[PDB]
Symmetry: C5
Subunit: 103 residues, 5 copies
């Protein structure tokens, strides 16, 4: 298996690493039908989403999508620095594939 | 693919944005049958609920409804200020569709 | 829907409101068979339970039962003041139907 | 229903109350196959387990076992003092049936 | 059952105990398809994973794998010192079977 977020990110097409090195600026969560999602933004001006579960997802990602939203919320509430995000850039806003935190 | 809570909220009928910019004053939770819900209030006097899950909800909303109630509880306990709420105004108290928070 | 704990409590028979206005003194949790329950006590001497899930509950209460024990646990740990409890008084100790907290 | 951990522990044979009055010294968690369990220790030298889910447990205990592991972890991390444990003494290490915390 | 992580770790082949005695330096989480995993690193240069769920896992490990990832996230966020890690050394990064922490 991969040893870092960049190596893992490099296995997927349509992705890029954003080096954030900052805590989350805003956290938005929706339970509106067909828009069950989370959106985060940074002072840098970037906006990112955890996509609504769909047909591009495989069954093993169900729990992982929910785990990623949980992580973003607690990270926001604890003011924890995000290091990097591995995102899919074929979506707007860019879609989170993975996150890393350090220190 | 909305990038803000206002863009998201505008995709639905019977919704309006409330700019709360304040922490939750009170948190109420019920496990009584047919009233499995959460009620929150603010010092402005405005009251909101997360609705009891029902026929108006699609199955993709089930985990999202549970997530929203989780978020309100930790938000209340941490004194986290809420920025905006997107709420369905055809229910009393108005019903939360989305929440945002910024730091 | 109800807008307050007292209005919601009043929809049910054999219930009453206890205005606690205090933090939980003690928290007990059991995973023993047929005693899968939580008991809270207050400095006042009053004791309440979240009952073991049984034939009196409906399917929609299953997750709400688990949420109320989740809430009491984090309320205890954070030493958060409870405002009111809506309880059924046809059980001993009285059984929790709803809780409210205010800051 | 029982009103205290000692009353509830008394409803079962092969149990005893250990009075702890202390925070957990060590927390151990395993996801190894057939050893999915948690072991806690105290500076007294006393050691307890949450057993691996199995044939000795009825269905209503499955979510309660997972809740006990969650309470041990958050209690460990917050340094919360444990009051009492009700344990089965026909297991080594003794097996947790219930826990209480006070103040 | 086992009373310590070393006992437990010794029941399996292809394992070893790493004495960490340190907080987690970095936490990485991926919801990317086929890489639904967590990776952690230490200032020692060691890197460990919670493997993606696969054919090597039995059903009882499903919830425990999700629990271990929950534990690594809250351990990271709180800067809780890990004592030991029991890992399978037939995977890269080495794969976590159990963790211990002491206060
Ligand atoms: O590139 C992919 N896989 C590469 C891979 C597979 C196996 C091993 C290693 C690498 C891959 C596979 C399935 C879907 C996929 O990507 C798609 O779905 C994603 C969510 O899962 C995002 O929504 C992306 O925007 C969408 O393009 C990307
Ligand atoms: O307006 C809606 N959808 C627009 C839409 C459709 C598809 C994608 C994005 C937006 C829509 C769809 C189903 C129900 C709905 O609204 C209804 O259900 C809500 C809970 O989900 C609330 O309880 C509202 O009070 C109730 O009026 C509103
Ligand atoms: O009084 C009730 N309902 C009024 C009501 C029904 C539906 C919607 C709103 C209000 C009602 C319905 C079913 C059980 C009930 O009460 C029963 O179950 C409770 C737990 O749910 C407690 O265990 C009470 O001790 C037991 O009497 C009380
Ligand atoms: O004593 C029990 N129930 C109380 C009771 C039973 C029967 C009559 C009266 C009271 C009881 C029931 C089922 C199992 C039980 O105990 C068993 O399983 C426990 C976990 O559930 C532990 O693993 C104990 O070590 C094991 O002996 C103890
Ligand atoms: O050696 C094993 N078990 C010994 C054992 C059995 C019963 C009780 C206690 C110990 C054992 C059993 C099943 C799988 C196993 O190991 C395998 O799966 C692991 C995850 O479960 C890791 O992925 C290891 O890398 C892979 O070899 C190792």
């Amino acid at each position: 298996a991969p040893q870092t977020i960049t190596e893992l990110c490099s296995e997927y097409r349509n992705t890029q690493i954003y080096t954030i090195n900052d805590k989350i600026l805003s956290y938005t969560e929706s339970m509106a039908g067909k828009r069950e999602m989370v959106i985060i933004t940074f002072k840098s001006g970037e906006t990112f989403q955890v996509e609504v579960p769909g047909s591009q997802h495989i069954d093993s990602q169900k729990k992982a999508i929910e785990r990623m939203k949980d992580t973003l919320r607690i990270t926001y509430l604890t003011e924890t620095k995000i290091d990097k995000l591995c995102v899919w850039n074929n979506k707007t806003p860019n879609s989170i594939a993975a996150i890393s935190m350090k220190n």
